[PDB]
Structure formats: structure tokens, C-alpha cells
């Protein structure tokens with residue numbers, strides 16, 4: 001019935017790095033082609049970019065976008081995506097059994113990111129390619145001019161260097177499904193040397209070393225330890241990847257999975273700190289959660305699409321249609337990410353844009369349309385800028401089918417100190433059972449209370465609305481905030 005929480009401005013965890021509200025676009029399915037890039041379309045600008053899509057990305061407010069992978073980077077040759085479009089070859093994408101026409105590549109994606117006010121986080125091919133190729137791409141992108149690959153960019157129509165600040169040293173390569181699969185020692189060495197060479201070309205860049213594909217890989221977290229043991233002095237981030245699903249059809253247990261995310265994050269931090277002690281380094285490795293989302297709906301349909309039907313262009317792959325309960329977990333995941341903002345400095349919702357996405361365009365050749373998961377992200381990105389406060393908390397507990405002592409309330413307050421605002425993000429994962437949250441602001445004028453709810457957890461959005469959308473409702477005295485929170489909803493409580 002009742003949950004108490006205490007909000008204290010003297011109680012920081014960390015300043016939020018806006019890059020934790022990043023996303024990710026892979027050359028996968030309809031993410032690029034028949035997605036963000038649709039040449040002949042009425043809704044497109046002169047570059048072929050869908051203008052309505054651009055507005056929806058700006059609406060989400062995404063500071064950084066991971067590109068171009070993902071699976072697909074592990075056998076990608078970046079040269080195929082630059083220069084005169086007529087001379088760009090069509091390539092086999094082994095990752096997703098598709099034909100990559102290479103009409104969009106780096107230069108094209110760079111000006112798309114400009115239009116959505118985002119910076120590129122570039123992944124390099126360390127599956128089938130190595131050090132010198134990563135050096136070539138970095139020179140192409142970051143060096144002003146007067147050398148082979150920098151002049152090549154100038155010739156291709158981009159005078160100013162892209163100045164890509166964050167680079168991914170390959171994609172997760174511990175999986176037996178990925179081309180250019182490496183052992184932890186093999187990748188550790190190639191990551192170390194690639195990183196060493198890259199920072200000689202541009203010392204200002206930041207580098208991400210790949211973690212495990214998932215925490216369920218037997219080589220987790222030893223991988224993380226081994227890779228960092230090699231590359232510590234030359235990398236800045238280790239990456240984490242996590243997806244959740246509700247195939248079991250257990251909403252209670254499904255919403256408890258943010259606790260597993262918390263444990264996952266802590267395990268990686270512990271691994272980082274262990275290697276830190278081994279190195280006697282004063283530097284902390286930070287966490288780049290460059291792949292996170294709900295993903296399970298389109299599993300069977302994807303298995304159909306291949307084989308079926310191989311080597312198509314832009315097949316409708318990974319097209320999850322998100323339910324309301326999915327939006328709740330995404331909200332819970334964002335809360336968890338925010339709790340660890342001291343170590344997590346970059347995070348990417350996978351993905352942006354048709355592929356397991358908050359933004360969907362129909363199919364040959366629009367509309368566009370927000371999924372349920374769009375809004376918890378939008379709220380987090382918009383009101384989650386500032387300083388994370390320690391969530392001292394006492395919430396009723398509940399057991400689920402596969403979890404014990406799961407908190408009914410999951411909450412964080414962030415204090416924006418240059419705007420004099422405090423924003424409380426709260427989720428209740430029960431779902432059964434409305435509860436009143438007594439927030440003792442010890443600082444510390446109610447402003448609004450935004451809510452995200454439905455009576456039907458399985459309800460979805462489509463091209464015709466929009467059954468999940470932020471209702472601006474509800475529902476102060478002295479230094480105390482009391483908040484009735486509906487049984488399962490995403491809550492954004494704002495004080496001035």
C-alpha cells in the first residue's frame with residue numbers, strides 16, 4: 001500500500017552524461033532502406049531522408065547514434081559506401097542474409113545525423129579486417145586534409161572532417177553466429193593494437209572495447225577482464241548488451257528483469273575495478289551500454305524470412321510491435337541505467353528505426369508512427385538531464401515465478417540545478433495493486449505529474465494511433481510529495 005522514499009540534494013550518485021540517451025542504427029532490415037532513407041518519397045527531403053522520421057528522432061532527442069553495426073560491421077568494407085554512387089558495389093551481408101546496395105554510407109549517414117542533431121559513434125570492422133583499415137577510416141573521417149584518405153573525403157564532397165569522437169572496436173565477436181569470431185585473447189590483442197594505432201592519428205577520440213554478446217555467454221565476464229587486461233591504457237569504455245523478452249507470458253516476472261540488469265551492470269563494474277587494481281591505474285573504465293531493448297515479438301517471423309527468401313534487399317527483419325508492458329520494462333531499464341550514471345556514460349537503445357524500434361515507418365513507403373516504448377525514452381531523455389540522486393527507498397516487495405523480493409516501486413530522482421527542477425521517475429510493477437509513494441524531498445512546488453498507463457498490458461500502437469501516449473494528469477504540501485501510482489505505470493513527477 002505505502003512506499004517511502006527520501007530525496008536529498010546533498011546525495012549525488014553522478015552527473016548524467018547525455019550520451020546515455022543514445023541510440024543505434026544498423027544496416028539491417030528496413031532501418032536504412034525503406035526506413036530513414038527513402039529517395040523517391042513525397043515525405044523526403046532532397047537527400048532522400050524522410051522528414052517525418054527526422055522530426056520523430058529530434059523528438060526523442062538522441063545525442064549519439066551507433067553506426068553501422070552491429071553484426072554487419074564484422075564483414076563490412078567502408079570503401080563500398082563512399083565515392084560516386086554509381087561505382088558503389090552491392091555486397092552480401094552474411095550477418096542478415098541480405099544484399100547491401102551501399103547507397104547509404106558514412107557520408108550519407110553523417111548528414112542525416114546533422115539533421116537529427118546527433119553525433120556518430122562509428123564501429124570499425126574487426127571481424128574480417130584489422131588495424132590499417134581502421135586507421136584508413138579514422139583518417140578519412142577525422143583528418144583535415146593533405147593525405148591519401150582525408151583528401152579522398154574532400155573529393156567525395158565533404159570538405160570538413162566529420163570529427164567522430166567515439167569509436168567502437170568491432171562488434172561483439174564471442175558468438176558462433178558472427179563472421180570473424182574471435183577468442184578473448186585474439187580480440188584483446190587486436191583491440192589493443194587497433195586502439196594504439198588510432199590514438200596516434202587522433203588523440204582526442206574515445207574508444208569502446210567490446211564486451212560479451214550477452215551475460216549468458218559462458219566466457220562472460222572473462223572476456224571483459226581479458227580484453228581490458230590487454231587494452232586498458234588505450235580504451236575508454238567496455239560495452240554491455242542486453243535484451244529481454246516475454247515469451248513465457250509472465251508480466252510480473254517480465255517486469256522484474258531490470259533487477260537482472262542491475263546485477264549485470266554491477267558485475268561489469270566489478271570486472272573493470274578488478275583490472276584497474278591489477279594495472280595500478282588511476283583511470284576508471286566507463287560503461288557503454290551500446291545495445292539495450294525489449295526484443296522477442298518478431299522471432300518466429302524472422303525465422304521464416306530466412307531461409308525462405310535469402311539475399312533480399314531491405315527485408316522486414318526484427319520488426320517487433322511493442323506492447324504496453326514492453327514500455328514499462330524499457331522505463332525500468334532507463335531507471336536502472338540512470339542509477340549507474342557514475343559509470344555508464346554512453347547507452348544505445350537498439351535500434352532507432354523500424355528494427356526493434358520506437359519509430360516505425362509502414363512499408364513501401366510510409367506512414368510513420370511511435371511505438372509504446374517511444375515515450376518512456378522521450379521522458380527520460382528530456383527530463384533526465386542533471387544530477388542523479390541516491391535512491392534511498394523502502395518499497396513493498398513481491399515474489400514472481402523466477403525472482404524473489406522484487407521491489408514494487410523502482411524510482412530515481414534527478415536534480416537539474418541550473419533550472420531549479422527535480423524530476424522523479426517511478427515505475428510500479430505491481431500491476432495489481434495501486435500504491436502511494438510518499439517522497440520526502442529534504443531540499444526541497446509541484447509542476448506536473450506525467451503518467452503512462454493502460455488497462456490492457458498487451459495493447460499496442462499502430463499506424464492508426466497510439467493507444468499508449470503520455471497522459472498529463474493526477475493525483476505538494478510542505479517538504480513532502482505524496483503520489484498515488486497506478487498498478488503498472490510509468491510516472492514522471494516534476495517539482496520546481
Ligand SMILES: OC[C@@H]1O[C@@H](OC[C@@H]2O[C@@H](OC[C@@H]3O[C@@H](O)[C@H](O)[C@H]3O)[C@H](O)[C@H]2O)[C@H](O)[C@H]1O
Nearest residue numbers: 026069070071072171172175177213291350351
Ligand atoms: O541489435 C541487433 C543485433 O543483435 C545483436 O546481437 C545479438 C543477436 O541476437 C541474438 O539472437 C537471439 C537468440 O535468442 C537467444 O535464445 C539466443 O541467444 C539467440 O539465438 C544472437 O545472439 C545474435 O544474433 C547484434 O549486435 C546486432 O546486430
